[PDB]
């Protein structure tokens, strides 16, 4: 579980260790329900034990004529999925790796992909019901982050919905969903997943509108890099749009963590009157212009790419900004910032931080 060693970089080993090899005689294939990258997807039934009643499943298959790399990549997804056990993460029943066709057998999600489901159900849920869907997705992502798993492809199309409307993250083992630092520098983290989650929030509250659909990919690239952002969906609580914008902070360290997101959404759901104030919706607006105070020492340090010293500050008792602004340049040396260039970068930043805490602006 969390904290335990994980196997995210060895597909065959994860298949061996974390999947149940299912005998083909236990699987009954029924109607086709989708087309995947590697082959058709079916609804079916699974006998897990000789003396047990069959249970409904989804059956993902690998197309005939596959290459061995396609086979490894296909089954590798199950090796990842089998390490997870959470209400909002797709549950793996097992795989067939010994006989053709290769199969991945999962719980059946009758309502399919969330973006398609919401378009089919346009306008038919309450805002509160939509926020509960987002809470379920966030809870799954909180679990993945705690499992030190970065998803990299979080989008409404990769959330599946079952008959009880439970939303579950899938797709283990797309510029409009990807954080700026992940596109430009390939820095994928749970914080870039949080960016994606903000996009998912926008997809859900718009009932499956395509993000930045008015724009080409090249225009999306300028938008995200320069700081343009999606405008509010129609009928979107201000608290929910403000959370989207927080997920889309340019500086990844300023984005909320998934544990924070779940707590925020829980508070809103428990007091649903908090959802009644809406963000101003103007149908003529397609994009917001760029937006023009550090909460933690870690945020401040990462803003200047000095996060490698975070624990050095904490251990010495410099755990808040109001403490940091009292630091001399010799204190920085004292706690272990040895490299002169790093001393200089922190010293200069502290000057600006001291300007900030001493700023006064009282309207009369
Ligand atoms: N457990 C499940 N229950 C019900 N339907 C499912 C399902 N798993 C997959 N599907 C259906 O099959 C479709 C495609 O499945 P899936 O997303 O796994 O293919 P894929 O993973 O190859 C796309 P990509 O290559 O972009 O990751 C889904 O849109 C979904 O409708
Ligand atoms: Mg997938």
mmCIF file of C-alpha atoms and ligand atoms in Angstrom:
data_model
loop_
_atom_site.group_PDB
_atom_site.id
_atom_site.type_symbol
_atom_site.label_atom_id
_atom_site.label_comp_id
_atom_site.label_asym_id
_atom_site.label_seq_id
_atom_site.Cartn_x
_atom_site.Cartn_y
_atom_site.Cartn_z
ATOM 1 C CA UNK A 1 0.000 0.000 0.000
ATOM 2 C CA UNK A 2 1.100 3.595 0.560
ATOM 3 C CA UNK A 3 4.708 3.792 1.697
ATOM 4 C CA UNK A 4 5.399 0.255 0.509
ATOM 5 C CA UNK A 5 7.707 -0.348 -2.475
ATOM 6 C CA UNK A 6 5.870 -0.119 -5.802
ATOM 7 C CA UNK A 7 6.521 -1.643 -9.240
ATOM 8 C CA UNK A 8 5.688 1.025 -11.832
ATOM 9 C CA UNK A 9 8.737 0.590 -14.122
ATOM 10 C CA UNK A 10 8.759 -3.187 -14.792
ATOM 11 C CA UNK A 11 5.631 -4.281 -16.693
ATOM 12 C CA UNK A 12 6.282 -8.028 -16.825
ATOM 13 C CA UNK A 13 7.237 -8.165 -13.151
ATOM 14 C CA UNK A 14 4.120 -6.220 -12.148
ATOM 15 C CA UNK A 15 1.992 -8.613 -14.222
ATOM 16 C CA UNK A 16 3.585 -11.591 -12.487
ATOM 17 C CA UNK A 17 3.342 -10.117 -9.000
ATOM 18 C CA UNK A 18 0.080 -8.147 -9.022
ATOM 19 C CA UNK A 19 -2.346 -9.811 -11.435
ATOM 20 C CA UNK A 20 -4.351 -13.020 -11.248
ATOM 21 C CA UNK A 21 -3.867 -15.248 -14.291
ATOM 22 C CA UNK A 22 -7.377 -16.253 -15.372
ATOM 23 C CA UNK A 23 -8.094 -19.445 -17.256
ATOM 24 C CA UNK A 24 -9.932 -18.719 -20.526
ATOM 25 C CA UNK A 25 -12.720 -21.169 -19.640
ATOM 26 C CA UNK A 26 -13.798 -18.812 -16.827
ATOM 27 C CA UNK A 27 -14.442 -15.901 -19.225
ATOM 28 C CA UNK A 28 -17.607 -15.538 -21.312
ATOM 29 C CA UNK A 29 -17.485 -12.804 -23.944
ATOM 30 C CA UNK A 30 -20.735 -10.980 -24.694
ATOM 31 C CA UNK A 31 -21.451 -7.757 -26.592
ATOM 32 C CA UNK A 32 -18.753 -5.408 -27.870
ATOM 33 C CA UNK A 33 -18.803 -2.160 -25.869
ATOM 34 C CA UNK A 34 -15.835 -0.197 -27.211
ATOM 35 C CA UNK A 35 -12.727 0.001 -29.337
ATOM 36 C CA UNK A 36 -9.405 0.476 -27.586
ATOM 37 C CA UNK A 37 -5.924 1.281 -28.812
ATOM 38 C CA UNK A 38 -4.952 -2.398 -28.707
ATOM 39 C CA UNK A 39 -8.232 -4.115 -29.593
ATOM 40 C CA UNK A 40 -11.937 -4.422 -28.967
ATOM 41 C CA UNK A 41 -13.495 -4.143 -25.505
ATOM 42 C CA UNK A 42 -16.360 -6.422 -24.515
ATOM 43 C CA UNK A 43 -18.901 -6.856 -21.786
ATOM 44 C CA UNK A 44 -18.777 -10.341 -20.360
ATOM 45 C CA UNK A 45 -19.070 -12.657 -17.397
ATOM 46 C CA UNK A 46 -16.348 -14.093 -15.181
ATOM 47 C CA UNK A 47 -16.324 -17.211 -13.007
ATOM 48 C CA UNK A 48 -13.722 -16.488 -10.326
ATOM 49 C CA UNK A 49 -14.048 -19.915 -8.691
ATOM 50 C CA UNK A 50 -15.530 -23.230 -9.775
ATOM 51 C CA UNK A 51 -18.316 -22.903 -7.222
ATOM 52 C CA UNK A 52 -19.128 -19.201 -7.604
ATOM 53 C CA UNK A 53 -21.735 -17.356 -9.646
ATOM 54 C CA UNK A 54 -20.460 -15.438 -12.656
ATOM 55 C CA UNK A 55 -19.909 -11.705 -12.182
ATOM 56 C CA UNK A 56 -20.153 -9.009 -14.888
ATOM 57 C CA UNK A 57 -16.850 -7.711 -16.235
ATOM 58 C CA UNK A 58 -15.297 -5.618 -18.954
ATOM 59 C CA UNK A 59 -12.874 -7.549 -21.158
ATOM 60 C CA UNK A 60 -10.199 -5.593 -23.005
ATOM 61 C CA UNK A 61 -8.541 -7.664 -25.724
ATOM 62 C CA UNK A 62 -5.356 -7.364 -27.762
ATOM 63 C CA UNK A 63 -5.839 -7.504 -31.532
ATOM 64 C CA UNK A 64 -4.528 -10.543 -33.372
ATOM 65 C CA UNK A 65 -1.176 -10.046 -35.055
ATOM 66 C CA UNK A 66 0.207 -7.990 -32.176
ATOM 67 C CA UNK A 67 3.925 -7.341 -31.791
ATOM 68 C CA UNK A 68 5.720 -8.363 -28.611
ATOM 69 C CA UNK A 69 6.148 -4.715 -27.621
ATOM 70 C CA UNK A 70 2.405 -4.166 -28.036
ATOM 71 C CA UNK A 71 1.843 -7.239 -25.859
ATOM 72 C CA UNK A 72 4.153 -6.040 -23.080
ATOM 73 C CA UNK A 73 2.665 -2.540 -23.199
ATOM 74 C CA UNK A 74 -0.906 -3.877 -23.218
ATOM 75 C CA UNK A 75 -0.538 -6.202 -20.242
ATOM 76 C CA UNK A 76 1.674 -3.734 -18.380
ATOM 77 C CA UNK A 77 -1.417 -1.652 -17.685
ATOM 78 C CA UNK A 78 -2.876 -4.509 -15.638
ATOM 79 C CA UNK A 79 0.388 -4.849 -13.727
ATOM 80 C CA UNK A 80 -0.072 -1.263 -12.554
ATOM 81 C CA UNK A 81 -3.824 -1.525 -11.943
ATOM 82 C CA UNK A 82 -3.422 -4.632 -9.776
ATOM 83 C CA UNK A 83 -1.366 -2.664 -7.244
ATOM 84 C CA UNK A 84 -4.328 -0.398 -6.474
ATOM 85 C CA UNK A 85 -7.358 -0.964 -4.261
ATOM 86 C CA UNK A 86 -9.665 2.049 -3.990
ATOM 87 C CA UNK A 87 -13.350 2.867 -4.430
ATOM 88 C CA UNK A 88 -12.550 5.390 -7.200
ATOM 89 C CA UNK A 89 -9.880 3.374 -9.054
ATOM 90 C CA UNK A 90 -10.918 0.783 -11.648
ATOM 91 C CA UNK A 91 -10.651 -2.696 -10.100
ATOM 92 C CA UNK A 92 -8.693 -5.417 -11.907
ATOM 93 C CA UNK A 93 -10.110 -8.930 -11.858
ATOM 94 C CA UNK A 94 -7.170 -10.443 -13.725
ATOM 95 C CA UNK A 95 -5.439 -11.046 -17.031
ATOM 96 C CA UNK A 96 -5.045 -13.765 -19.600
ATOM 97 C CA UNK A 97 -1.409 -13.756 -20.679
ATOM 98 C CA UNK A 98 -0.843 -17.442 -21.467
ATOM 99 C CA UNK A 99 -3.412 -17.878 -24.250
ATOM 100 C CA UNK A 100 -4.592 -15.809 -27.172
ATOM 101 C CA UNK A 101 -6.176 -13.355 -27.228
ATOM 102 C CA UNK A 102 -4.437 -11.447 -24.442
ATOM 103 C CA UNK A 103 -7.075 -10.049 -22.094
ATOM 104 C CA UNK A 104 -7.432 -7.548 -19.273
ATOM 105 C CA UNK A 105 -10.548 -8.225 -17.195
ATOM 106 C CA UNK A 106 -11.915 -5.455 -14.990
ATOM 107 C CA UNK A 107 -15.053 -4.478 -13.173
ATOM 108 C CA UNK A 108 -17.818 -3.470 -15.578
ATOM 109 C CA UNK A 109 -18.589 0.269 -15.783
ATOM 110 C CA UNK A 110 -21.996 0.328 -17.416
ATOM 111 C CA UNK A 111 -22.100 4.073 -18.115
ATOM 112 C CA UNK A 112 -18.715 4.166 -19.834
ATOM 113 C CA UNK A 113 -16.496 7.204 -20.222
ATOM 114 C CA UNK A 114 -17.481 10.281 -18.236
ATOM 115 C CA UNK A 115 -17.189 12.854 -21.025
ATOM 116 C CA UNK A 116 -19.472 10.821 -23.304
ATOM 117 C CA UNK A 117 -21.853 10.096 -20.408
ATOM 118 C CA UNK A 118 -22.235 13.772 -19.503
ATOM 119 C CA UNK A 119 -22.838 14.763 -23.118
ATOM 120 C CA UNK A 120 -25.503 12.052 -23.379
ATOM 121 C CA UNK A 121 -26.991 13.338 -20.094
ATOM 122 C CA UNK A 122 -26.604 17.043 -20.880
ATOM 123 C CA UNK A 123 -28.061 19.202 -18.132
ATOM 124 C CA UNK A 124 -29.776 16.322 -16.338
ATOM 125 C CA UNK A 125 -27.911 16.396 -12.995
ATOM 126 C CA UNK A 126 -27.792 18.960 -10.224
ATOM 127 C CA UNK A 127 -24.663 21.017 -9.618
ATOM 128 C CA UNK A 128 -24.313 19.203 -6.301
ATOM 129 C CA UNK A 129 -24.390 15.826 -8.065
ATOM 130 C CA UNK A 130 -21.699 17.029 -10.475
ATOM 131 C CA UNK A 131 -19.533 18.198 -7.577
ATOM 132 C CA UNK A 132 -19.881 14.770 -5.982
ATOM 133 C CA UNK A 133 -18.535 13.237 -9.181
ATOM 134 C CA UNK A 134 -15.535 15.556 -8.953
ATOM 135 C CA UNK A 135 -15.061 14.571 -5.305
ATOM 136 C CA UNK A 136 -14.929 10.905 -6.276
ATOM 137 C CA UNK A 137 -12.348 11.590 -8.985
ATOM 138 C CA UNK A 138 -10.292 13.638 -6.525
ATOM 139 C CA UNK A 139 -10.417 10.860 -3.928
ATOM 140 C CA UNK A 140 -9.036 8.430 -6.492
ATOM 141 C CA UNK A 141 -6.286 10.878 -7.404
ATOM 142 C CA UNK A 142 -5.482 11.498 -3.730
ATOM 143 C CA UNK A 143 -4.990 7.738 -3.412
ATOM 144 C CA UNK A 144 -2.756 7.564 -6.489
ATOM 145 C CA UNK A 145 -0.651 10.474 -5.235
ATOM 146 C CA UNK A 146 -0.290 8.698 -1.880
ATOM 147 C CA UNK A 147 0.832 5.612 -3.863
ATOM 148 C CA UNK A 148 3.488 7.843 -5.501
ATOM 149 C CA UNK A 149 1.858 7.231 -8.888
ATOM 150 C CA UNK A 150 1.746 10.091 -11.406
ATOM 151 C CA UNK A 151 -1.032 9.489 -13.928
ATOM 152 C CA UNK A 152 0.066 11.844 -16.753
ATOM 153 C CA UNK A 153 -3.182 11.377 -18.740
ATOM 154 C CA UNK A 154 -5.961 12.508 -16.388
ATOM 155 C CA UNK A 155 -8.964 13.589 -18.475
ATOM 156 C CA UNK A 156 -12.708 12.981 -18.421
ATOM 157 C CA UNK A 157 -12.358 10.385 -21.190
ATOM 158 C CA UNK A 158 -10.245 8.284 -18.786
ATOM 159 C CA UNK A 159 -12.798 8.395 -15.957
ATOM 160 C CA UNK A 160 -15.323 5.547 -16.091
ATOM 161 C CA UNK A 161 -18.826 5.594 -14.588
ATOM 162 C CA UNK A 162 -20.686 2.560 -13.225
ATOM 163 C CA UNK A 163 -24.389 1.861 -12.774
ATOM 164 C CA UNK A 164 -24.451 3.605 -9.372
ATOM 165 C CA UNK A 165 -22.777 6.724 -10.897
ATOM 166 C CA UNK A 166 -19.487 6.100 -9.082
ATOM 167 C CA UNK A 167 -16.647 7.726 -11.038
ATOM 168 C CA UNK A 168 -13.358 5.833 -11.232
ATOM 169 C CA UNK A 169 -9.952 6.731 -12.616
ATOM 170 C CA UNK A 170 -8.691 4.417 -15.355
ATOM 171 C CA UNK A 171 -5.857 4.300 -17.924
ATOM 172 C CA UNK A 172 -2.566 3.135 -16.392
ATOM 173 C CA UNK A 173 0.896 2.114 -17.521
ATOM 174 C CA UNK A 174 -2.659 15.527 -25.003
ATOM 175 C CA UNK A 175 -1.673 19.135 -24.676
ATOM 176 C CA UNK A 176 -5.058 20.532 -23.642
ATOM 177 C CA UNK A 177 -4.891 18.618 -20.333
ATOM 178 C CA UNK A 178 -1.154 18.861 -19.571
ATOM 179 C CA UNK A 179 0.518 21.336 -17.226
ATOM 180 C CA UNK A 180 2.863 23.917 -18.805
ATOM 181 C CA UNK A 181 5.973 22.559 -17.093
ATOM 182 C CA UNK A 182 5.069 19.028 -18.204
ATOM 183 C CA UNK A 183 4.785 20.094 -21.848
ATOM 184 C CA UNK A 184 7.888 22.271 -22.026
ATOM 185 C CA UNK A 185 10.197 20.312 -19.688
ATOM 186 C CA UNK A 186 8.490 16.881 -19.339
ATOM 187 C CA UNK A 187 8.278 17.452 -15.559
ATOM 188 C CA UNK A 188 5.360 15.166 -14.672
ATOM 189 C CA UNK A 189 4.317 15.193 -11.015
ATOM 190 C CA UNK A 190 1.167 14.902 -8.950
ATOM 191 C CA UNK A 191 1.046 18.701 -9.272
ATOM 192 C CA UNK A 192 0.821 18.429 -13.063
ATOM 193 C CA UNK A 193 -1.927 15.858 -12.455
ATOM 194 C CA UNK A 194 -3.666 18.549 -10.372
ATOM 195 C CA UNK A 195 -3.551 20.840 -13.409
ATOM 196 C CA UNK A 196 -5.233 18.076 -15.402
ATOM 197 C CA UNK A 197 -7.826 17.653 -12.661
ATOM 198 C CA UNK A 198 -8.721 21.325 -13.024
ATOM 199 C CA UNK A 199 -9.350 20.671 -16.710
ATOM 200 C CA UNK A 200 -11.488 17.650 -15.728
ATOM 201 C CA UNK A 201 -13.482 19.918 -13.411
ATOM 202 C CA UNK A 202 -14.176 22.186 -16.386
ATOM 203 C CA UNK A 203 -15.170 19.203 -18.531
ATOM 204 C CA UNK A 204 -17.613 17.992 -15.886
ATOM 205 C CA UNK A 205 -19.272 21.338 -15.191
ATOM 206 C CA UNK A 206 -19.700 21.994 -18.939
ATOM 207 C CA UNK A 207 -21.155 18.489 -19.506
ATOM 208 C CA UNK A 208 -18.301 17.422 -21.742
ATOM 209 C CA UNK A 209 -17.297 20.529 -23.668
ATOM 210 C CA UNK A 210 -13.922 20.143 -25.333
ATOM 211 C CA UNK A 211 -11.301 22.344 -23.620
ATOM 212 C CA UNK A 212 -10.142 25.273 -25.754
ATOM 213 C CA UNK A 213 -12.194 23.916 -28.664
ATOM 214 C CA UNK A 214 -12.138 27.332 -30.374
ATOM 215 C CA UNK A 215 -8.335 27.128 -30.615
ATOM 216 C CA UNK A 216 -5.747 25.184 -32.564
ATOM 217 C CA UNK A 217 -3.044 23.272 -30.714
ATOM 218 C CA UNK A 218 -0.497 25.989 -31.536
ATOM 219 C CA UNK A 219 -2.883 28.577 -30.083
ATOM 220 C CA UNK A 220 -3.423 26.442 -26.968
ATOM 221 C CA UNK A 221 0.361 26.364 -26.541
ATOM 222 C CA UNK A 222 0.578 30.165 -26.512
ATOM 223 C CA UNK A 223 -2.406 30.397 -24.161
ATOM 224 C CA UNK A 224 -1.066 28.057 -21.479
ATOM 225 C CA UNK A 225 2.496 29.399 -21.719
ATOM 226 C CA UNK A 226 1.446 33.061 -21.581
ATOM 227 C CA UNK A 227 -1.103 32.468 -18.823
ATOM 228 C CA UNK A 228 -4.446 32.565 -20.623
ATOM 229 C CA UNK A 229 -7.016 30.335 -18.931
ATOM 230 C CA UNK A 230 -10.394 28.805 -19.614
ATOM 231 C CA UNK A 231 -13.379 30.951 -18.569
ATOM 232 C CA UNK A 232 -16.055 29.779 -16.194
ATOM 233 C CA UNK A 233 -18.593 27.184 -17.323
ATOM 234 C CA UNK A 234 -22.250 28.118 -17.271
ATOM 235 C CA UNK A 235 -23.972 27.496 -13.928
ATOM 236 C CA UNK A 236 -20.665 26.917 -12.149
ATOM 237 C CA UNK A 237 -20.317 27.748 -8.430
ATOM 238 C CA UNK A 238 -17.728 30.462 -7.850
ATOM 239 C CA UNK A 239 -16.022 28.207 -5.306
ATOM 240 C CA UNK A 240 -15.646 25.530 -8.000
ATOM 241 C CA UNK A 241 -14.332 27.875 -10.692
ATOM 242 C CA UNK A 242 -11.917 29.409 -8.183
ATOM 243 C CA UNK A 243 -10.632 25.905 -7.399
ATOM 244 C CA UNK A 244 -10.109 25.283 -11.138
ATOM 245 C CA UNK A 245 -8.035 28.458 -11.385
ATOM 246 C CA UNK A 246 -6.011 27.327 -8.360
ATOM 247 C CA UNK A 247 -5.336 23.972 -10.044
ATOM 248 C CA UNK A 248 -4.091 26.023 -13.019
ATOM 249 C CA UNK A 249 -1.557 28.144 -11.126
ATOM 250 C CA UNK A 250 1.509 28.725 -13.296
ATOM 251 C CA UNK A 251 3.832 27.836 -10.399
ATOM 252 C CA UNK A 252 3.156 24.154 -9.718
ATOM 253 C CA UNK A 253 4.036 24.491 -6.015
ATOM 254 C CA UNK A 254 1.142 26.927 -5.551
ATOM 255 C CA UNK A 255 -1.436 24.389 -6.760
ATOM 256 C CA UNK A 256 -3.483 22.554 -4.116
ATOM 257 C CA UNK A 257 -2.581 18.965 -3.329
ATOM 258 C CA UNK A 258 -5.171 16.273 -4.008
ATOM 259 C CA UNK A 259 -5.702 15.783 -0.265
ATOM 260 C CA UNK A 260 -6.538 19.501 -0.102
ATOM 261 C CA UNK A 261 -8.925 19.219 -3.062
ATOM 262 C CA UNK A 262 -10.882 16.404 -1.429
ATOM 263 C CA UNK A 263 -11.172 18.416 1.787
ATOM 264 C CA UNK A 264 -12.313 21.534 -0.094
ATOM 265 C CA UNK A 265 -14.943 19.623 -2.062
ATOM 266 C CA UNK A 266 -16.137 17.800 1.050
ATOM 267 C CA UNK A 267 -16.694 21.120 2.836
ATOM 268 C CA UNK A 268 -18.739 22.443 -0.094
ATOM 269 C CA UNK A 269 -20.812 19.263 -0.325
ATOM 270 C CA UNK A 270 -21.536 19.198 3.417
ATOM 271 C CA UNK A 271 -22.852 22.798 3.256
ATOM 272 C CA UNK A 272 -24.342 22.913 -0.244
ATOM 273 C CA UNK A 273 -25.588 26.491 0.168
ATOM 274 C CA UNK A 274 -21.915 27.338 -0.445
ATOM 275 C CA UNK A 275 -22.472 26.281 -4.078
ATOM 276 C CA UNK A 276 -25.275 28.736 -4.860
ATOM 277 C CA UNK A 277 -23.115 31.785 -5.636
ATOM 278 C CA UNK A 278 -22.066 31.358 -9.273
ATOM 279 C CA UNK A 279 -19.146 32.656 -11.291
ATOM 280 C CA UNK A 280 -20.243 35.336 -13.753
ATOM 281 C CA UNK A 281 -21.060 33.593 -17.035
ATOM 282 C CA UNK A 282 -20.732 35.571 -20.282
ATOM 283 C CA UNK A 283 -21.404 33.454 -23.410
ATOM 284 C CA UNK A 284 -19.186 35.746 -25.518
ATOM 285 C CA UNK A 285 -16.042 34.932 -23.515
ATOM 286 C CA UNK A 286 -13.921 32.086 -24.854
ATOM 287 C CA UNK A 287 -10.634 32.678 -23.000
ATOM 288 C CA UNK A 288 -9.350 34.697 -20.050
ATOM 289 C CA UNK A 289 -6.378 37.058 -20.229
ATOM 290 C CA UNK A 290 -3.300 36.184 -18.145
ATOM 291 C CA UNK A 291 -3.583 36.755 -14.411
ATOM 292 C CA UNK A 292 -1.284 39.370 -12.903
ATOM 293 C CA UNK A 293 2.063 35.760 -1.384
ATOM 294 C CA UNK A 294 3.803 32.508 -0.452
ATOM 295 C CA UNK A 295 1.846 30.330 1.974
ATOM 296 C CA UNK A 296 4.698 27.933 2.823
ATOM 297 C CA UNK A 297 8.487 27.939 2.873
ATOM 298 C CA UNK A 298 8.374 25.092 0.346
ATOM 299 C CA UNK A 299 6.391 27.218 -2.110
ATOM 300 C CA UNK A 300 8.820 30.115 -1.759
ATOM 301 C CA UNK A 301 11.867 27.890 -2.228
ATOM 302 C CA UNK A 302 10.451 26.145 -5.285
ATOM 303 C CA UNK A 303 9.599 29.489 -6.901
ATOM 304 C CA UNK A 304 13.360 30.128 -7.052
ATOM 305 C CA UNK A 305 14.263 26.476 -7.797
ATOM 306 C CA UNK A 306 15.866 26.044 -4.355
ATOM 307 C CA UNK A 307 13.473 23.353 -3.075
ATOM 308 C CA UNK A 308 16.456 21.052 -2.531
ATOM 309 C CA UNK A 309 17.026 23.023 0.690
ATOM 310 C CA UNK A 310 13.452 22.760 2.012
ATOM 311 C CA UNK A 311 14.312 20.212 4.703
ATOM 312 C CA UNK A 312 17.376 22.260 5.672
ATOM 313 C CA UNK A 313 15.079 25.170 6.552
ATOM 314 C CA UNK A 314 12.523 23.001 8.361
ATOM 315 C CA UNK A 315 15.079 21.172 10.511
ATOM 316 C CA UNK A 316 16.551 24.477 11.730
ATOM 317 C CA UNK A 317 13.114 25.819 12.696
ATOM 318 C CA UNK A 318 12.509 28.127 9.710
ATOM 319 C CA UNK A 319 9.086 26.616 9.057
ATOM 320 C CA UNK A 320 7.078 29.753 8.174
ATOM 321 C CA UNK A 321 7.645 32.807 6.002
ATOM 322 C CA UNK A 322 7.434 35.208 8.947
ATOM 323 C CA UNK A 323 10.351 33.261 10.430
ATOM 324 C CA UNK A 324 12.326 33.249 7.174
ATOM 325 C CA UNK A 325 12.188 37.034 6.765
ATOM 326 C CA UNK A 326 14.198 37.311 10.007
ATOM 327 C CA UNK A 327 17.106 35.369 8.486
ATOM 328 C CA UNK A 328 20.515 36.920 8.033
ATOM 329 C CA UNK A 329 22.745 35.862 5.154
ATOM 330 C CA UNK A 330 24.921 34.036 7.710
ATOM 331 C CA UNK A 331 21.914 31.979 8.843
ATOM 332 C CA UNK A 332 21.605 30.692 5.270
ATOM 333 C CA UNK A 333 25.207 29.480 5.405
ATOM 334 C CA UNK A 334 24.608 28.083 8.892
ATOM 335 C CA UNK A 335 21.787 25.720 7.883
ATOM 336 C CA UNK A 336 23.763 24.225 5.005
ATOM 337 C CA UNK A 337 23.435 26.450 1.933
ATOM 338 C CA UNK A 338 27.115 26.224 1.018
ATOM 339 C CA UNK A 339 27.238 27.015 -2.700
ATOM 340 C CA UNK A 340 27.819 30.783 -3.147
ATOM 341 C CA UNK A 341 25.475 31.032 -6.135
ATOM 342 C CA UNK A 342 22.698 29.463 -4.075
ATOM 343 C CA UNK A 343 23.436 31.790 -1.169
ATOM 344 C CA UNK A 344 23.122 34.693 -3.600
ATOM 345 C CA UNK A 345 19.818 33.482 -5.040
ATOM 346 C CA UNK A 346 18.253 33.008 -1.599
ATOM 347 C CA UNK A 347 19.657 36.297 -0.276
ATOM 348 C CA UNK A 348 18.180 38.290 -3.166
ATOM 349 C CA UNK A 349 14.822 36.530 -2.880
ATOM 350 C CA UNK A 350 14.680 37.226 0.867
ATOM 351 C CA UNK A 351 14.943 40.957 0.141
ATOM 352 C CA UNK A 352 11.813 40.754 -1.992
ATOM 353 C CA UNK A 353 10.130 38.594 0.634
ATOM 354 C CA UNK A 354 10.919 41.217 3.282
ATOM 355 C CA UNK A 355 9.378 43.865 1.015
ATOM 356 C CA UNK A 356 6.229 41.715 0.787
ATOM 357 C CA UNK A 357 5.561 41.106 4.479
ATOM 358 C CA UNK A 358 6.058 44.813 5.254
ATOM 359 C CA UNK A 359 3.649 46.005 2.536
ATOM 360 C CA UNK A 360 0.681 48.052 3.769
ATOM 361 C CA UNK A 361 -2.501 48.671 1.796
ATOM 362 C CA UNK A 362 -5.513 49.716 3.874
ATOM 363 C CA UNK A 363 -8.415 51.291 1.928
ATOM 364 C CA UNK A 364 -10.108 54.031 3.906
HETATM 365 N N1 LIG B 1 -14.318 -1.369 -17.369
HETATM 366 C C1 LIG B 1 -15.062 -0.858 -18.486
HETATM 367 N N2 LIG B 1 -16.401 -0.861 -18.416
HETATM 368 C C2 LIG B 1 -17.176 -0.394 -19.409
HETATM 369 N N3 LIG B 1 -16.596 0.096 -20.526
HETATM 370 C C3 LIG B 1 -15.253 0.119 -20.655
HETATM 371 C C4 LIG B 1 -14.416 -0.369 -19.624
HETATM 372 N N4 LIG B 1 -13.141 -0.211 -20.043
HETATM 373 C C5 LIG B 1 -13.151 0.334 -21.266
HETATM 374 N N5 LIG B 1 -14.427 0.544 -21.667
HETATM 375 C C6 LIG B 1 -14.927 1.101 -22.877
HETATM 376 O O1 LIG B 1 -14.033 0.870 -24.018
HETATM 377 C C7 LIG B 1 -13.615 2.220 -24.429
HETATM 378 C C8 LIG B 1 -12.174 2.229 -24.661
HETATM 379 O O2 LIG B 1 -11.553 1.662 -23.576
HETATM 380 P P1 LIG B 1 -10.107 2.129 -23.203
HETATM 381 O O3 LIG B 1 -10.152 3.575 -22.767
HETATM 382 O O4 LIG B 1 -9.558 1.294 -22.077
HETATM 383 O O5 LIG B 1 -9.200 1.977 -24.494
HETATM 384 P P2 LIG B 1 -7.738 2.571 -24.501
HETATM 385 O O6 LIG B 1 -7.205 2.505 -23.082
HETATM 386 O O7 LIG B 1 -6.820 1.719 -25.459
HETATM 387 C C9 LIG B 1 -7.785 4.333 -25.096
HETATM 388 P P3 LIG B 1 -6.096 5.114 -24.981
HETATM 389 O O8 LIG B 1 -5.115 4.413 -25.981
HETATM 390 O O9 LIG B 1 -6.201 6.572 -25.317
HETATM 391 O O10 LIG B 1 -5.544 4.952 -23.552
HETATM 392 C C10 LIG B 1 -13.959 3.129 -23.358
HETATM 393 O O11 LIG B 1 -14.342 4.418 -23.881
HETATM 394 C C11 LIG B 1 -15.065 2.533 -22.693
HETATM 395 O O12 LIG B 1 -16.267 3.016 -23.285
HETATM 396 MG MG1 LIG B 2 -6.329 3.723 -21.661
#
